[PDB]
Design a protein around this nucleic acid. Structure first.
Ligand SMILES: [K+]
Ligand SMILES: [K+]
Ligand SMILES: [K+]
Ligand SMILES: [Mg+2]
Ligand SMILES: [Mg+2]
Ligand SMILES: [Mg+2]
Ligand SMILES: [Mg+2]
Ligand SMILES: [Mg+2]
Ligand SMILES: [Mg+2]
Ligand SMILES: [Mg+2]
Ligand SMILES: [Mg+2]
Ligand SMILES: [Mg+2]
Ligand SMILES: [Mg+2]
Ligand SMILES: [Mg+2]
Ligand SMILES: [Mg+2]
Ligand SMILES: [Mg+2]
Ligand SMILES: [Mg+2]
Ligand SMILES: [Mg+2]
Ligand SMILES: [Mg+2]
Ligand SMILES: [Mg+2]
Ligand SMILES: [Mg+2]
Ligand SMILES: [Mg+2]
Ligand SMILES: [Mg+2]
Ligand SMILES: [Mg+2]
Ligand SMILES: [Mg+2]
Ligand SMILES: [Mg+2]
Ligand SMILES: [Mg+2]
Ligand SMILES: [Mg+2]
Ligand SMILES: [Mg+2]
Ligand SMILES: [Mg+2]
Ligand SMILES: [Mg+2]
Ligand SMILES: [Mg+2]
Ligand SMILES: [Mg+2]
Ligand SMILES: [Mg+2]
Ligand SMILES: [Mg+2]
Ligand SMILES: [Mg+2]
Ligand SMILES: [Mg+2]
Ligand SMILES: [Mg+2]
Ligand SMILES: [Mg+2]
Ligand SMILES: [Mg+2]
Ligand SMILES: [Mg+2]
Ligand SMILES: [Mg+2]
Ligand SMILES: [Mg+2]
Ligand SMILES: [Mg+2]
Lengths: 63, 129, 386
RNA sequence: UUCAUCUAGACAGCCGGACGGUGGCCAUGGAAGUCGGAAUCCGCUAAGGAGUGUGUAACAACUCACCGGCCGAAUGAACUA
RNA sequence: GUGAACAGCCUCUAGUUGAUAGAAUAAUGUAGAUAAGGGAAGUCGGCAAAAUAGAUCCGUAACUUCGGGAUAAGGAUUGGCUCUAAGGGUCGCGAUCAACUU
RNA sequence: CUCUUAAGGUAGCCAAAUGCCUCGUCAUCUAAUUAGUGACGCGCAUGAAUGGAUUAACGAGAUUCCCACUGUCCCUAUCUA
RNA sequence: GCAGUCAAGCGUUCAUAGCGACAUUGCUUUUUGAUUCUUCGAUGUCGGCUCUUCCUAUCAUACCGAAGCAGAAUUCGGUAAGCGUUGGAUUGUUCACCCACUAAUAGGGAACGUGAGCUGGGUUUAGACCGUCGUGAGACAGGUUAGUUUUACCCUACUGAUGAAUGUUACCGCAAUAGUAAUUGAACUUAGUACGAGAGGAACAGUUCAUUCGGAUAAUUGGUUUUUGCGGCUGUCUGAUCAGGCAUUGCCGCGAAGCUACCAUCCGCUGGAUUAUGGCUGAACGCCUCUAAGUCAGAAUCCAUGCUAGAACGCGGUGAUUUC
RNA sequence: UGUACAACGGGGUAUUGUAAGCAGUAGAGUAGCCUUGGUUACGAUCUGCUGAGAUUAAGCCUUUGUUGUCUGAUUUGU
């Protein structure tokens, strides 16, 4: 089994968790839960959502 | 030949025509292989063969019943590996009763279940899931 | 006139009446047919439904589209600490059916099972079996006489076992006592097995093994009074319906001039005895085995208990049975796992499953981490600690 | 009930034969007792039909009616209610 | 106060706190809501509901009794904050005073 | 040319809220239409202030289609008082 | 409406594979009549929706017999009602018709089942329009438009729920009786095989799935939100801040738990006796004969296994049974 | 009178999404001041402390902590 990564929040997705969204341009997005899925559908920016690994990397959190 | 997929396209659903046959959408009027139950609408899923009409498209394609194959669903379905997934839209391609495509190319991705079920769709496909 | 459009009836008339079960512990109404060549063994076991989780395994099913591929499957975890043998019942065959000739009890009964014989334990003087235990005074002549009667008679032998609820996280504290049929030959040998195992524990691995098909017997979750729409699945009436729409419109023809038993009516839903068969055992895990939730593919040293504990149950600290799929009854309910009544050879049974990974993320939410160590590794240092 | 067969051997079964002229004539593409057409010819007859049918391109050949042997006393048909 | 507003919503003065209560939270109701995918396939019939909605700017067809149709249709924008510009009175270009609208 | 009792349905309009036959016929709309619309008209039984035809605007009037929209439905589920 | 008998003929030849004239015997009460027995101090008048059950004159599925059965397809027939028998366009409609799926889209009953179950489109009061008729008021089984669908708290029935009495009380059980359930398809393979000149073209066994149904279950996904849990936002009020009230849950995003969805997952048993039918031996009837005695196999049938309830006046085993 | 139960508290789990307060050579600018190269006031917002703060069983899990509770009524005999 392989752990995937949430395309919005960077969270680890274990088998069966969350959803997979295939955009019209054939790009694949993986969401660990409906919260990240809903923020993505709302077009929020992960760099502006403060608990995401993208936000934390951009704001040098944890390093 | 294919596991059960959540039905997302009851009769009357209009999906986009993903092929280049000149049709712009397919209007589901029936689902091949569907069972019977009082009041239950026949409903298609990814990989299903349906009877459809072209609502907008080439006039030589319009006003007639033709077979079609659902290649994108947009209703979440669970694969056997536990993945709940869905496309951005519902889309199908015009085919003959044997599964051979009327058009010669698919626009957009195609579900893997549909690709395994129908080789001609697979042969004309690009990205598969 | 005729129905004008055919449709199957709503519900199964074989599960009638939809009444509350007479006990919270569903009865085993049939045990496996006795094969008197095998060794003496319990035909069933008692456990407590802890909760559900999900596993990943490679499917071994040649010809399938998912042969040798990974599949995600729901599993039910049944906490199964060893049961204590405290008695033995002899059953004689009569033209009126099976009849219990006699029951021989163990000399010492723990307070766990003694509580089963009381409605008000705390204020009782706890006299249960005090005069019986004196039958073991010097040589146990009465005990041996009763066991000899069981051997001379009693074509069927069942042991009395009780759960050890003190080993479960449940607050109940009153054990569940049940008759389990002893299969394996020589009624004499059945009685000998029972006598030797008096006051002794029988573990779940001595009864069940990996890949085995077993049946779950339990009282379903209760839902109280229910209307026909959800009790029987009848069609909702149109929005325009005066006097309500969660009903059956015609509850009968003019004749017979009686509502018929086969018509859906509102009433009790749930809390019914169910016996669901052919649940494959995926794990026979052991409580003493830390890394209970580990596999040969994972190796993460973790128990079966999810992060935060099984919701509304607690932690699994005992031996446990993980069966594929779901079983009747809710969490914390006593369930009986019995061996299959028939020899299933269908390539669905006989499949040797090997778990690759067991989910231990919290079921109290969208759990993202399998272990506290993994949560620490992902999140780094926090303010309180870590 | 009526009509018949019947110890001067009834029906059934089994066994043996079932001819000469003659594979008759006519012909049928090919007919040989018999796809076949007229006469069902004479003799030897217990019997044998130009054959009763089958088989074969035809054949070769069988087979039955028929006659005998055995068997031993009943049997067949059409009707009535 | 918001706001175009005697709208809706909140408040001051004044008035009232009166409708039999307590406890539970089954079914079925009445009233109020939500819903994946589909989108009228339901039904006599889109009944009911939903969708739309203020204002500013753009744009607006057939037809017409030339008045309308018209808010046709169809687009965009709107918060907060910090600024900029324009729009006045009175007195003798200066002085002083003053309110909102864009 | 006549005759019934004077005239003999003109301009228009129509299976029309008026057409029995009738779900008329043709076209169109639909996958499919006893629906709608446009035509046709020996029109059971249309027709001229018993007003005919048409009409912009208006309509809590009747009707068809389309876009949007949706628990009307597929197929039900859940929450509040 | 359905089913027989006869058999002139059709069926290349052949009455009866499949049909069948002239006749003739019936059955049914899902047609419409006929009648006027019940109801006029009132049995709610179409259709649909919903739901249960029953019938079989069987459309499908099971197993079979026959064929003008080579295969495939089909047709005729038997046991069979166990099981299913649909989604739509038009119409109030029953009916009809067409589109389409399907294994199949069989026919019927139950006060032409079912209005204190709904609905009210039609019909079927009163408003109104038209056409024809009528001098007129008015008429029309002609068209059109609008038109209040009341009551259960009683009894029984049904669904669930308690419960006196058996010395008391407790636990573990038995099982009379009653109910009962699974269903159908596809693909692969068998096999381009058998069969056939060819065109075409099976089936048994095996495998993987699916349909319809049912019973659970909530790990996951989705729905639901008074967790009014966290955050955001408007308007106002508390002098400002902080923090809050109100806006009948103020609105928005997320939202755990619980509930829950073929919108989610899991599970849905195997023995015997039979029917039709095909047979064995075998007389009747020296032969023959599945039948008469005896007997083998055999259907989605039936009875069990299994599953549900547990007789509240069926039963068993077992624990303890009150110092005053 | 206990691996007892409860109420709190602690920890885990989970939800949201970074609390209040303080600070900043952050901030479109505007207005002042003078040592005209910086200062003061206002300023949506931004940044740091701060994945912080809040909530978390009401039908989540757990508990070497704190505090408390533990003999009321009725009835039953072969
Ligand atoms: K009457
Ligand atoms: K949920
Ligand atoms: K406020
Ligand atoms: Mg959710
Ligand atoms: Mg329907
Ligand atoms: Mg029927
Ligand atoms: Mg259910
Ligand atoms: Mg109503
Ligand atoms: Mg959970
Ligand atoms: Mg104002
Ligand atoms: Mg929806
Ligand atoms: Mg949606
Ligand atoms: Mg749409
Ligand atoms: Mg419709
Ligand atoms: Mg309909
Ligand atoms: Mg209609
Ligand atoms: Mg409306
Ligand atoms: Mg506009
Ligand atoms: Mg207009
Ligand atoms: Mg004219
Ligand atoms: Mg006309
Ligand atoms: Mg017209
Ligand atoms: Mg229509
Ligand atoms: Mg005139
Ligand atoms: Mg007129
Ligand atoms: Mg008016
Ligand atoms: Mg009379
Ligand atoms: Mg009366
Ligand atoms: Mg009455
Ligand atoms: Mg009545
Ligand atoms: Mg029959
Ligand atoms: Mg009726
Ligand atoms: Mg009634
Ligand atoms: Mg009524
Ligand atoms: Mg009615
Ligand atoms: Mg009406
Ligand atoms: Mg009227
Ligand atoms: Mg007149
Ligand atoms: Mg809310
Ligand atoms: Mg107030
Ligand atoms: Mg509030
Ligand atoms: Mg024989
Ligand atoms: Mg016999
Ligand atoms: Mg009883």
């Amino acid at each position: 089994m392989k752990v995937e990564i949430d395309s919005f929040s960077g969270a680890k997705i274990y088998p069966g968790r969350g959803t997979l969204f295939v955009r019209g341009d054939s790009k694949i997005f993986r969401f660990q839960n409906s919260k990240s899925a809903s923020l993505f559908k709302q077009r929020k920016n992960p760099r502006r959502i403060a608990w995401t690994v993208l936000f934390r990397k951009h704001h040098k959190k944890g390093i | 030949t294919k596991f059960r997929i959540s039905l997302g396209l009851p009769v009357g659903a209009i999906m986009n025509c993903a092929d280049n046959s000149g049709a712009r959408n397919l209007y589901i009027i029936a689902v091949k292989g569907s069972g019977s139950r009082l009041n239950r609408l026949p409903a298609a899923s990814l990989g299903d063969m349906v009877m459809a009409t072209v609502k907008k498209g080439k006039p030589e394609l319009r006003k007639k019943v033709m077979p079609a194959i659902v290649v994108r669903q947009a209703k979440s379905w669970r694969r056997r590996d536990g993945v709940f997934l869905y496309f951005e839209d519902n889309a199908g391609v015009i085919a003959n009763p044997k599964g051979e495509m009327k058009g010669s190319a698919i626009t957009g991705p195609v579900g893997k279940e549909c690709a395994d079920l129908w080789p001609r769709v697979a042969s004309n496909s690009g990205v598969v899931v | 006139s005729h129905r004008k459009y055919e449709a199957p009836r709503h519900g199964h008339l074989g599960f009638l009446p939809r009444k509350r079960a007479a006990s919270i512990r569903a009865r085993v109404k049939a045990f496996p047919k006795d094969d008197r060549s095998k060794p003496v063994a319990l035909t069933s076991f008692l456990g407590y439904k802890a909760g559900m989780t999900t596993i990943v395994r490679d499917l071994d099913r040649p010809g399938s589209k998912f042969h040798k591929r990974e599949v995600v499957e729901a599993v039910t975890v049944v906490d199964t600490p060893p049961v204590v043998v405290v008695g033995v019942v002899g059953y004689v065959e009569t033209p009126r059916g099976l009849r219990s000739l006699t029951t021989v009890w163990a000399e010492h009964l723990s307070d766990e099972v003694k509580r089963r014989f009381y409605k008000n334990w705390y204020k009782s003087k706890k006299k249960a079996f005090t005069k019986y235990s004196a039958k073991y005074a010097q040589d146990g002549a009465g005990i041996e006489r009763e066991l000899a009667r069981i051997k001379k008679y009693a074509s069927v032998v069942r042991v009395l076992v009780h759960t050890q609820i003190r080993k479960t996280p449940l607050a109940q504290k009153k054990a569940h006592l049940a008759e389990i049929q002893l299969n394996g030959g020589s009624i004499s040998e059945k009685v000998d097995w029972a006598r030797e195992h008096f006051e002794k524990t029988v573990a779940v691995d001595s009864v069940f093994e990996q890949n085995e098909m077993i049946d779950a017997i339990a009282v379903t979750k209760g839902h109280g009074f229910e209307g026909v729409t959800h009790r029987w699945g009848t069609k909702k009436l149109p929005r325009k319906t005066h006097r309500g729409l969660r009903k059956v419109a015609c509850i009968g023809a003019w004749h017979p001039a009686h509502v018929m038993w086969s018509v859906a009516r509102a009433g009790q839903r749930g809390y019914h005895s169910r016996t669901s068969i052919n649940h494959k055992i995926y794990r026979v895990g052991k409580g003493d085995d830390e890394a209970n939730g580990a596999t040969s593919f994972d190796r993460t040293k973790k128990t079966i208990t999810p992060m935060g504990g099984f919701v509304h149950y607690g932690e699994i600290k005992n031996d446990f049975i993980m069966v594929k799929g779901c079983i009747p009854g809710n969490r914390k309910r006593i369930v009986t796992l019995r061996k299959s009544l028939y020899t299933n050879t269908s390539r669905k049974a006989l499949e040797e499953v090997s778990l690759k990974w067991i989910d231990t993320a919290s079921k109290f939410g969208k759990g993202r981490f399998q272990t506290p160590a993994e949560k620490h590794a992902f999140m780094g240092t926090l303010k309180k600690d870590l």
